[PDB]
């Protein structure tokens, strides 16, 4: 009896802009926005994710959560793909792009209820984004000289470890910066050849001990056992290593060469045949001067027995990804065939031994000041495997953070912990009053949308929101005898753990975010926020 | 009057439903009209997101149960096959023309007089179309004017920040493939290829051709200022004997002898290739040699070619090998035995852009390439789809300017003037009919939908901006001169569309008025809506 | 924003209800307009069916909960007291003006600009109101023109057969009461009386006064020509002693002697009355004597008055005694002792029209009656109610013609010309405002509802007649002379309302344009509806 208007399409559901889908889309995103509000910051919260495979994990990072969540609704998919856009090109800012673009839509609703057109809302953010990106170039304080010093790496890595794993910040900083300095070569004024691969730093973890027992070695570390009867090599430097793609066994013919059995007389000759040939092959290989054979394939029983009499360390590496990085260290090259270890194909390694880590013995691969290595490994130790795995995720994001320091002006930095946020708000309001027209309403709301980051750090830390907000405003608003406002821009949002009062200077704890991450996060989050406002209707149809 | 399993809409309520159904589609598609419009999102249910403001691309991806909108979707399909742009504009013209006629339908006016009044006004619209149109010179030095045509096409489908990026790309794409001395152009010569892992503002124009698979070796040269290009069909990798045989080696050194003896057939062809580089301009500076060779190349030949500093490509698409014949000019060499320096082509700077996941090879700076490439960059999939839709619509819009020498000013200059013309003309002419005056006046009032919609998506008052234009037209008419007036969407006042650089194609507006009139008339000609099997 | 037991319609939702509220009341009253209008039924709930075409009786008998129709009914009641005609005309102007305004409300036009456009156009309508009006001479020999005014008020509510019956009745009723000079006219001097048993087409006009009680006796004269009139206040019947007493008779004949002795006091006054007739024109022909006496008369005196051939009335209405005193001229005689022949009045032929049940005595043919009577005849109560509506509205229509010397031609001549006036004037003037153009154009197009619905009730195509009239007005302006054009309902073409004799009162049209504008203005000023305290 009661008719229905607005839907002529196949009994589907399509929200017209007159029904306020944009307000409904922001409300659906607000549910996801509140998830990240308890994430960012060292005081943030961890979320338990129960996988469909029956595995329970817990992580702070929201980008890992979005991958474990099934995203369908179109307004949410925009920020998920925008989060993946933040995941590429940098290893930090996952919680930054989600909270920022979420608040830009929150303040946009107050303009929609006012009646301000969505196109005039997008035009306001685009003009305010260019004002922000231009101002952030002048808001830079220091710049990393790319000296590659350990102390210079401690300045960048320390704030990256924060907001993910807290309390391990100073302990993991010495472990990460040591392995990075091993991969970073010694050069200056050369920007043509890129370097510092992420895969160049391997992270292994063994249960037992604590972070105090964790060390840093130069080389790859393998979990597999020393299959051969030789547990470790001598202390003499530069041992030759041969990488074999072919398994260790009697050689075959490139044409056919299929083993067939007819009479028992042939079976007795097959055993003695493989006995004499393998003994002849392993001999000549060991006679070439190579004391370590890395086999990418299986190892025969007789082939392993003869190499044990010659004192040859046998270590099997079935993973081809580890053999590629092994070539960048020892210098050896994989041979598809077997029996011809050319000395030009042979590499050199100083020390190959087997060490007991966490109670289990593993054969490592390393060096001391020779046959330089482009690959390093971090050995982590801990009692809880769960939290120890989250340490590996914080280190991998710290390695990607060092990759953020490169030629495209990565060394530029800005004070973090809400110090730049509050200062940028007052600088955008300076642009608001100077820009006439209706843009003033959108520019001011664009600056208010940056209040979510400082309020987030104060809310998750247990601090009083009503007390911290004016302390941030009164600190960055001062009266100076001149145009430039002088001594102290360093007042941030203070995460205490202590008792008494107030905010702190960024120079005290040296906790800051680089300009490359913050400038890229704002440009992507604003473009993603203006994108959601561009869709006033969605239509689903059969493919 | 019924049988089993039948439904019929008979009286005038049938036409009221068809118009109302068309009025529902109008309200949906009027939001994306113009550069101030909105960007609609589509979901196929499998998780694919597509962002486009084009009318047909939306209508083809949506399934419509309403039979009236299906005819509009079929009509918008013929508009892209002819005009290629303005499918949304046709929808806005059909719907409002039915709404304005619906007012007269309730008055008791028969639809024939309504449809005949639209055909008479369409004939007068074509007469005004020839007088209002502007004849643009065929000169190719008009790029300054082409910068205005590019903005008219780009500003609709982009945020207007990608306009400055895509304006030199699209404009250089059309004129480069455009043949001199007033010949035609081929849009197929401009290749559109999408890539990931870079921002959309980094989109650049490629004068030559780009290839996917690059040379894999650490010592390959980064850039070569000038090089001689070789197109080879011969496999440079390890091969096998043409007849069945086998390699039986007593020792490991004998196996290398049998392997080198078989590669010697390839090595004999390899020596002829490397010696040809020293044969022509070997010691000469600003000279090089590149191997685009189609079939595979073993790492043994890659090490030899690296010592000579020769770029070696392998595993190339068969279609791209034929494109290099036009772009580079070098002929395809089927056999190295017949290889000669006259077969090789010449190219300009060839530099390999190295990204970790993807390696790029640039054939650009060619003497007579006659083929362009537009490399579209984006991080996500929807960023590539929105830009590609702007490029495909941007290349055809500029192509219609060189093909059709007639141009029309945009910003509603043709719509507002023709609406004012037909209203004042029929009163002075009076040569149609007395009852036709309703159909003529309804069509003139239906032409105002576009200038009212452009300011509706902009948010400005449509009544205020229309009165300012009517005051300027009346002042220009009393001044006895020719002044083209249009609506400025940014400021909100009027503007001269010739100075502001907002231009619409002649073929787009010619088939829009004729197309929208014929489709909207056929909907009014429907007496009864029959439904069978429902 | 709500509390229990409350209802609120806000944010333009009240406008959609109020405009629909006018469309519902309009479509009901759209049926009856002009002479082609329709008849409706009004049930009072007591079982009495009343059929009338007057919008005044309709709006009062129907109960409407819609508050929009309440203001229309209340304002029309003020128009019915002032104008007295055109109740439907005001409603049709209000409803259509809101329909044309609601179309602009959907466009986003603020209602204040819409109401301001109505007030500006109303002020310009008053200027054309004084220019378009025709000044009629003050001569009372204009009855020929009064025949045209009569047909205007008659043909609307009747089959046009009662028009020829009521045309000489209404026209003679006004001019007989109205003395020749400029003074005034009194509608109270015209009595409205209804009788049964005879067809409505036999309705006649009474120059004198009509009364019910006649002389009761078989021998009394039925027709007496040119007789003297006596107004007598004293009781001629038998009287009793003011104090309690009794009649004691000793003999049977004494009982009649005591009764004759008490009546002798009344018989003494009876002898003085009959001596007056014997003193003045006793045997003289063409002269008579009539007793209108107010109090009762016993049958004994009626038998005595019959032998003298005296018409004797008894138990006369008190109001009629004073009216017959002014009509006949004879003074009221309280006591017979003061009776004199100089007090007697004079009247013409007095004849009794006697049906089966009732007797009708006529006072007509009077020297200076100064009072008329309209006796309405009908077989049922349907013809008596419909004729009474035509007489009351017919007398007030001619009354406004003598009071207001200005007259306007009807048949849509005022509405079509003014609508064409504001169309051409606003384009030439352009001195109001740009946004006001919507309110002015909506007001000009809304006044077309009367000429459109007038021919729509006739059955002829409204689009055809409005085109021929508009073409005739354009041909009249091209010839450069004054031509008044109006619609012809019988034929369907145009005509001259001055020749056809269709005229509309100036005061009716002055308050119709001003009234309907103020009604629709206050309705558009309502943004939100609120129901509280219920």
Q: What is the resolution of this structure in A?
A: 4.6
Q: How many interface pairs between A and B have CB atoms less than 8 angstroms apart?
A: 118
Task: List Cα–Cα distances, C230 to A374, B129, C277, C329, C342, in angstroms.
Answer: 146, 95, 11, 9, 11
Distance (Å, rounded) from C-alpha A258 to C-alpha A133? Answer: 69
Q: In CATH, what number is assigned to the domain containing residue C26?
A: 1.10.560.10
Say how far residue C92 (Cα) sits from the centre of its chain: 22
Phi first, then psi: give them for residue B494, nearest 5 degrees: -80, 175
Chain B contact set for C461 (CB, 8 A): 108
Chain C contact set for B467 (CB, 8 A): 434-435, 437
Last residue of a domain, one of B369, B388, B418: B369
Distance (Å, rounded) from C-alpha C344 to C-alpha C333? Answer: 9
Chain B contact set for A252 (CB, 8 A): none
Neighbouring-strand partners of residue B52? B40
Nearest one of C310, C171, C148, C316 to C232, comparing CA atoms: C316
Last residue of a domain, one of C369, C387, C417: C369
C216 and C167 assigned to the same domain: no
C391 and C415 assigned to the same domain: no
Task: List Cα–Cα distances, A324 to A216, A365, A371, B215, B318, in angstroms.
Answer: 21, 14, 16, 19, 32
Q: Which helix (H) or strand (E) holds B210?
A: strand B210-211
- Check if the beta carbon of residue A319 is closer than 8 Å to that of residue A334: no
SS3 A295: strand
Residue A126 structure tokens: 């685009």
C379 and C474 assigned to the same domain: no
Chain C contact set for B468 (CB, 8 A): 434
Last residue of a domain, one of C353, C388, C405: C405
B43 and B162 assigned to the same domain: no
Distance (Å, rounded) from C-alpha B65 to C-alpha B73? Answer: 12
Distance (Å, rounded) from C-alpha C152 to C-alpha A260? Answer: 127
* C154: exposed, middle or buried (Cβ count in 10 Å: 0-12, 13-18, 19+): buried
C44 and C114 assigned to the same domain: yes
Q: Do chains C and A touch (3 or more CB pairs under 8 A)?
A: no
* End-to-end Cα distance, chain C: 17
Boundaries of domain holding C232: 208-369
What's the angle, vertex CA B128, arms to CA B126 and CA B133, rounded to 5? Answer: 95
Nearest one of A223, A224, A222, A215 to A381, comparing CA atoms: A215
CA distance C467 to chain B (A): 6
B349 and B386 assigned to the same domain: no
C108 and C118 assigned to the same domain: yes
Distance (Å, rounded) from C-alpha A121 to C-alpha A98? Answer: 20
Which of B22, B55, B62, B69 to probe by mutation at the A interface, max A CB count within 10 Å? B62
Say how far residue C130 (Cα) sits from the centre of its chain: 27
Distance (Å, rounded) from C-alpha B377 to C-alpha B369? Answer: 23
User: For chain A, what are the domain ranges?
Assistant: 1-143+412-543, 144-218+371-411, 219-370
B217 and B362 assigned to the same domain: yes
Q: Strand B210-211's sheet: what is its strand order?
A: B210-211, B359-362, B350-354, B223-224
Q: Which of C108, C435, C463 sits opposite B435 (nearest CB)?
A: C463
Task: Give the count of beta carbons closer than 10 Å to the beta carbon of residue B484.
Answer: 20
Between residues 272 and 331 of chain B, which touch chain A (CB distance below 8 Å)?
A: none
Residue C416 structure tokens: 């079509």
What's the angle, vertex CA B521, arms to CA B65 and CA B527, rounded to 5? Answer: 70
Distance (Å, rounded) from C-alpha B514 to C-alpha B412? Answer: 17
User: Would you say how long chain A is, in residues?
Assistant: 543
Distance (Å, rounded) from C-alpha C101 to C-alpha C103? Answer: 5
C353 and C379 assigned to the same domain: no
C475 lies within 8 A of chain B by CB: no
Q: Experimental technique used?
A: cryo-EM
Helix B87-105 vs helix B67-82: angle between axes, to the nearest 10 degrees?
140
Nearest one of C25, C171, C27, C23 to C100, comparing CA atoms: C23
C235 and C360 assigned to the same domain: yes
C399 and C414 assigned to the same domain: no
DSSP B36-50: TS--EEEE-SSS-EE
Neighbouring-strand partners of residue B354? B359
Distance (Å, rounded) from C-alpha C408 to C-alpha C406? Answer: 7
Nearest one of C295, C310, C287, C294 to C216, comparing CA atoms: C310
Distance (Å, rounded) from C-alpha A70 to C-alpha B326? Answer: 48
C345 and C378 assigned to the same domain: no
* B513: exposed, middle or buried (Cβ count in 10 Å: 0-12, 13-18, 19+): buried
Chain B contact set for C467 (CB, 8 A): 434-435, 437
Nearest one of B386, B384, B379 to B40, comparing CA atoms: B386
Distance (Å, rounded) from C-alpha C34 to C-alpha C51? Answer: 17
Q: Which residues of B397-421 are buried (b: 16+ CB within 10 A; e: fewer)?
A: bbbbbbeeebbbbbbbbbbbbbbbb
- Check if the beta carbon of residue A66 is closer than 8 Å to that of residue A129: no
Neighbouring-strand partners of residue C354? C359
B174: number of CA atoms within 13 Å, CB side?
27
Q: Which of B24, B43, B49 sits opposite A8 (nearest CB)?
A: B24
C251: number of CA atoms within 13 Å, CB side?
3
Task: List Cα–Cα distances, C55 to B378, C89, C90, in angstroms.
Answer: 73, 9, 10
Nearest one of A416, A408, A424 to A139, comparing CA atoms: A424
Distance (Å, rounded) from C-alpha A176 to C-alpha A154? Answer: 9
- Check if the beta carbon of residue A323 is closer than 8 Å to that of residue A243: yes
B108 lies within 8 A of chain C by CB: yes
Q: How many domains are contained in chain B?
A: 3
Nearest one of A110, A121, A139 to A23, comparing CA atoms: A110
Domain A144-218+371-411, CATH class in plain words: alpha beta
User: Does the distance separating the beta carbons of A117 and B27 come in below 8 Å?
Assistant: no
- Phi/psi region, residue B41 (left: phi>0; alpha: psi -120 to 50; beta: rest), is beta
Phi first, then psi: give them for residue C57, nearest 5 degrees: -75, -30
User: Does the distance separating the beta carbons of B36 and A119 come in below 8 Å?
Assistant: yes
Task: Give the count of beta carbons closer than 10 Å to the beta carbon of residue C88.
Answer: 27
Distance (Å, rounded) from C-alpha C185 to C-alpha C177? Answer: 7
Chain A contact set for B457 (CB, 8 A): 117, 119
Hey, which bits of B400-519 come out as E strands?
A: 406-409, 486-487, 494-495, 503-505
Task: Please tell us whether the domain made up of A1-143+412-543 is placed in CATH 3.40.630.10.
Answer: no
Q: Please list, in sequence order, all residues whose beta carbon lies within 8 angstroms of the beta carbon of residue C243, skipping any fewer than 6 positions away.
A: none
C462 lies within 8 A of chain B by CB: yes
Topology of the domain comprising A219-370: GroEL (3.50.7)
CA distance B44 to chain A (A): 5
């Amino acid at each position: 009896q009661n008719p229905n208007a607005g839907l002529f399409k196949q009994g589907y559901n399509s929200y017209s802009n007159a029904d306020g889908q944009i307000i409904k889309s922001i409300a659906a995103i607000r549910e996801l926005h509140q998830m990240c509000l308890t994430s960012m910051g060292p005081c943030g919260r961890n979320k338990i994710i129960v996988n469909h495979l029956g595995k329970i994990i817990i992580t702070n990072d929201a980008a890992t959560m979005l991958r474990e969540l099934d995203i369908v609704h179109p307004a949410v998919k925009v920020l998920v793909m925008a989060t993946e856009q933040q995941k590429i090109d940098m290893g930090d800012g996952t919680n930054l792009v989600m909270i920022l673009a979420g608040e830009l839509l929150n303040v946009s609703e107050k303009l929609i209820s006012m009646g301000l057109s969505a196109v005039e809302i997008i035009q306001g953010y685009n003009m305010a984004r260019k004002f922000t990106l231009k101002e952030l170039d002048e808001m830079v304080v220091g710049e990393i000289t790319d000296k590659n010093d350990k102390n210079e790496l401690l300045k960048m890595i320390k704030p990256v470890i924060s907001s993910k794993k807290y309390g391990s910040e100073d302990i993991l900083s010495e472990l990460v910066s040591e392995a990075v300095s091993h991969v970073l070569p010694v050069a200056q004024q050369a920007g043509e050849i890129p370097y510092f691969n992420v895969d160049s730093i391997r992270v292994v973890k063994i249960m037992g001990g604590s972070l105090s027992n964790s060390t840093v070695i130069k080389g790859m570390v393998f979990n597999r056992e020393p299959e051969g009867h030789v547990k470790s090599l001598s202390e003499d430097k530069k041992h030759k290593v041969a990488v074999f793609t072919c398994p260790l066994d009697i050689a075959n013919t490139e044409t056919k060469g299929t083993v067939l059995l007819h009479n028992a007389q042939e079976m007795l000759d097959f055993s003695k045949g493989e006995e004499k040939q393998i003994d002849a092959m392993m001999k000549e290989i060991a006679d070439m001067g190579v004391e370590c054979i890395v086999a990418g394939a299986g190892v025969g029983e007789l082939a392993l027995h003869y190499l044990n009499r010659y004192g040859i360390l046998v270590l099997k590496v079935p993973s081809k990804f580890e053999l590629r990085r092994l070539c960048r260290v020892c210098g050896a090259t994989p041979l598809p065939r077997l029996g011809a270890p050319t000395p030009e194909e042979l590499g050199l390694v100083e020390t190959v031994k087997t060490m007991e880590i966490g109670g289990d013995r593993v054969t490592v691969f390393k060096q001391e000041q020779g046959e330089i290595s482009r690959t390093s490994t971090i050995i982590l130790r801990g009692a809880t495997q769960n939290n120890l795995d989250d340490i590996e995720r914080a280190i991998d994001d710290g390695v990607a953070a060092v990759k953020g320091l490169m030629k495209p002006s990565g060394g530029k930095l800005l004070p973090g912990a809400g110090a730049t946020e509050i200062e940028l708000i007052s600088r955008i309001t300076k642009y608001g009053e100077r820009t006439p027209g209706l843009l003033q309403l959108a520019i001011k709301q664009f600056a208010v949308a940056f209040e979510v980051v400082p309020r987030t750090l104060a809310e998750t830390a247990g601090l009083d929101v009503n007390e911290v907000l004016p302390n941030l405003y009164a600190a960055h608003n001062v009266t100076e005898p001149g145009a430039v406002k002088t001594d102290h821009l360093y007042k941030g949002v203070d995460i205490d753990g202590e008792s008494d009062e107030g905010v702190k200077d960024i120079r005290e704890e040296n906790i800051y975010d680089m300009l490359a991450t913050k400038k890229f996060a704002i440009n992507v989050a604003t473009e993603a926020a203006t994108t959601v406002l561009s869709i006033d209707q969605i239509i689903m149809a059969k493919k | 009057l019924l049988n089993p399993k039948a439904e019929s809409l008979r009286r005038d309520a049938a036409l009221k439903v068809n118009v109302t159904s068309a009025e529902g589609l109008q309200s949906v598609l009027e939001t994306n009209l113009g550069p101030k419009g909105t960007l609609k999102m589509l979901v196929d249910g499998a998780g694919n997101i597509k962002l486009t403001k084009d009318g047909k691309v939306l209508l083809t991806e949506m399934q419509i149960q309403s039979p009236t909108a299906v005819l509009i979707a079929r009509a918008a399909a013929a508009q892209d096959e002819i005009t290629g742009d303005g499918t949304t504009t046709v929808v806005c013209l059909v719907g409002e023309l039915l709404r304005q006629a619906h007012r007269f339908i309730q008055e008791g006016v028969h639809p024939r007089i309504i449809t005949d009044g639209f055909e008479i006004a369409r004939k007068e619209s074509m007469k005004f179309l020839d007088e209002f149109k502007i004849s643009k010179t065929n000169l190719s030095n008009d790029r300054e004017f082409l910068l205005q045509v590019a903005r008219s096409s780009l500003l609709t489908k982009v945020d207007a920040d990608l306009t400055e990026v895509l304006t030199p790309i699209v404009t250089d794409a059309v004129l480069s493939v455009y043949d001199a001395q007033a010949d035609n152009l081929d849009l197929h010569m401009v290749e559109i290829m999408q890539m990931q892992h870079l921002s959309p503002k980094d989109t650049t124009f490629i004068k030559g051709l780009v290839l996917d698979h690059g040379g894999r070796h650490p010592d390959m040269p980064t850039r070569v200022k000038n090089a001689y290009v070789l197109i080879l069909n011969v496999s440079l990798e390890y091969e096998k004997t043409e007849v069945n045989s086998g390699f039986f080696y007593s020792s490991a050194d004998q196996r290398d002898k049998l392997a080198a003896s078989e590669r010697k057939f390839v090595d004999a062809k390899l020596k002829k290739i490397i010696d040809l580089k020293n044969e022509v301009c070997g010691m000469d500076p600003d000279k090089g040699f590149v191997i685009i060779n189609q079939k595979g190349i073993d790492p043994m030949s890659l090490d030899v070619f690296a010592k000579h500093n020769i770029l070696a490509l392998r595993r190339a698409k068969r279609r791209n090998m034929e494109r290099l014949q036009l772009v580079t000019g070098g002929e395809a060499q089927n056999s190295v035995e017949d290889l000669s320096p006259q077969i090789l082509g010449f190219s300009g700077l060839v530099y390999q852009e190295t990204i970790g996941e993807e390696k790029f090879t640039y054939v650009t700076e060619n003497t007579d390439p006659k083929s362009c490439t537009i490399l579209i960059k984006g991080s996500t999939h929807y960023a590539l789809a929105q830009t590609k839709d702007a490029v495909r619509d941007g290349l055809r819009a500029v192509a219609n300017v060189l093909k059709d020498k007639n141009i029309i000013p945009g910003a509603g200059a043709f719509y507002i003037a023709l609406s004012r013309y037909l209203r004042s003309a029929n009163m002075n002419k009076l040569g149609a009919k007395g009852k036709t005056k309703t159909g003529i006046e309804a069509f003139a009032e239906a032409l105002l939908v576009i200038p009212k919609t452009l300011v509706k998506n902009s948010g400005f008052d449509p009544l205020d901006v229309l009165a300012m234009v009517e005051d300027e037209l009346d002042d220009a008419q009393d001044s006895d001169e020719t002044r083209y007036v249009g609506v400025d969407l940014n400021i909100g006042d009027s503007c001269d569309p010739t100075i502001e650089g907002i231009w619409d194609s002649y073929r787009v507006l010619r088939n829009a008025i004729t197309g929208a009139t014929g489709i909207a008339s056929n909907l009014l000609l429907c007496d009864e809506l029959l439904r069978a099997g429902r």
